[PDB]
Design a protein around this ligand. Structure first.
Ligand SMILES: Cc1ccc(S)c(S)c1
Ligand SMILES: Cc1ccc(S)c(S)c1
Ligand SMILES: [Zn+2]
Ligand SMILES: [Zn+2]
Lengths: 306, 306
């Protein structure tokens, strides 16, 4: 039946994207009710970025220093304030397309959909995982700042990421919708770099369960393992240590497949020590760590192929 | 800067999805202007599928044998006809969310975005390539029939696929929006199976160009090759033969990177004969064939890293 990295339908978010311009800088903003949220560096010039003092740069702006464009309409700013690394612009109009929503700060290992945008116009959508090192391997070009990440539950959009910068290795960093950065990054020019990363163990296990639900059992084995013995192998292969909380989370998947979590860990240990011998799992030649246990339950059938 | 399999924003299509029920069968339909399009097998029962005569099964239905639900509203059918493998239901209301659109029959190797839907409610979006063997490796569960594939240019939605069935190997088959199947498949129960497939050479080359644009040149070499000598290697590795039309298509990418097409073919030939030696390209350990030259130009920077 297939297994794909799928994103949430993006319509509810497309209706919230606008363009924000201050001086010569234009980037994207998120328009919810009567507020537009955007990266605070929209107020900076290239030189400002070397050592910007945002409090000082901002007090020098007025409400009209900001130009907000929604589609083909101009929104009038009637207030502004800084909240951590974001600017909150109050506008004269409430977005009629505002969806039911909330702001959530996602945890490392969790996934979300990104709606890449330029000049307030959505251009593409794809799924990303927040890495343990607090970066995401997105696809972004100049002008994408302010693009957002989100999940959708029922008809409530949980916004969890706003894009702010690209690091030397080509990976990306940003904030939650309260403007607090994920990771130790800052919105200014420094020698900052992505720290060391690690494979998301819980997700790789979830994905092996997805492969079984979809009818594949070739990588299973007759062994079991202790959490501690598993972690000795995990440390060697740069996998996050597995905890009992992670084992508990895998409970439902374990029950749907009849495969005990620690027995699946034994299967993983063997895959790490012996490789995959030219075989594939769910079409992949490598162990995938960008699907959470939740993503698997969402996409896979509730009935294992058996 | 990253490279992801990204789909087109799905909003314009979400506003067109509805549910169509005939008897005990419910699947998805596409509502454009005053017409709803859906798989004709919605009129069949399980037994009907063994050897259905659609002309005979359909003449036995009336306009009211069909229930069309848009969100929470019931649409009244005032006409119906069969067009190849689809049903075209005329309804009493014109969709106010109808986007500018057109129906296109995509060619093998080309890509499109799929909006997976159930009960007329969009659940996810992902990018697929139409394989040379006319199937797509989608992610679909029971109830997904009628889900559509599309591309978006400017603000015109080009619909190119409607989902109808899953084959024994777990891959998927469907039709264009005139109801003609892609491939030799039929909407009934038979021993039909996906034919042999092949790697999409032109796309793998496009992707190697994307990797160079993004700053990576490790797999290049000092050799060149003739189209014929390249094809002898392609035949051995089950790659589609490269033609001069394919070489011409790669012209712009070749110019942006300063790498002659046949020299890039020499690089591919070497990658196929020697493997990738534990290295990755654009984060991948394998040669990717699901990005067209058009997808690359769309997502990559217009300035090579150099
Ligand atoms: C050069 C440059 C211009 C605009 C933005 S928003 C950034 S992050 C960098
Ligand atoms: C069992 C079954 C029920 C409904 C549809 S639309 C199909 S394709 C198969
Ligand atoms: Zn920026
Ligand atoms: Zn069906």
């Amino acid at each position: 039946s297939g297994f794909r990295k799928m994103a949430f339908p993006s319509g509810k978010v497309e209706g919230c994207m606008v363009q924000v311009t201050c001086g010569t800088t234009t980037l994207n903003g998120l328009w919810l009710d009567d507020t537009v949220y955007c990266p605070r560096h929209v107020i900076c010039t290239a030189e400002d970025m070397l050592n910007p003092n945002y409090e000082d740069l901002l007090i020098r702006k007025s409400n009209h220093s900001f130009l907000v464009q929604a589609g083909n309409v101009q929104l009038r700013v009637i207030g502004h304030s800084m909240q951590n690394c974001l600017l909150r612009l109050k506008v004269d109009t409430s977005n009629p397309k505002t969806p039911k929503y909330k702001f959530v700060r996602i945890q490392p290992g969790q996934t979300f959909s990104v709606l890449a945008c330029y000049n307030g116009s959505p251009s593409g959508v794809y799924q990303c995982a927040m890495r343990p090192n607090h970066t995401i391997k997105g696809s972004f070009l100049n002008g994408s700042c302010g693009s957002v990440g989100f999940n959708i539950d029922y008809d409530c959009v949980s916004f969890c990421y706003m894009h702010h910068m690209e690091l030397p290795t080509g990976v990306h960093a940003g904030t939650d919708l309260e403007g607090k950065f994920y990771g130790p990054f800052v919105d200014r020019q420094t020698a900052q770099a992505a720290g060391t990363d690690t494979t998301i163990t819980l997700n790789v296990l979830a994905w092996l369960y997805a492969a079984v639900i979809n009818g594949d059992r070739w990588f299973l084995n007759r062994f079991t393992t202790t959490l501690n013995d598993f972690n000795l192998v995990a440390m060697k292969y740069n996998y996050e240590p597995l905890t009992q909380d992670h084992v508990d989370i895998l409970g439902p998947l374990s029950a749907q497949t009849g495969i005990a979590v620690l027995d699946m860990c034994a299967a993983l240990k063997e895959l790490l020590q012996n490789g995959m011998n030219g075989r594939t799992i769910l079409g992949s030649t490598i162990l995938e760590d960008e699907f959470t246990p939740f993503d698997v339950v969402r996409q896979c059938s509730g009935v294992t192929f058996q």
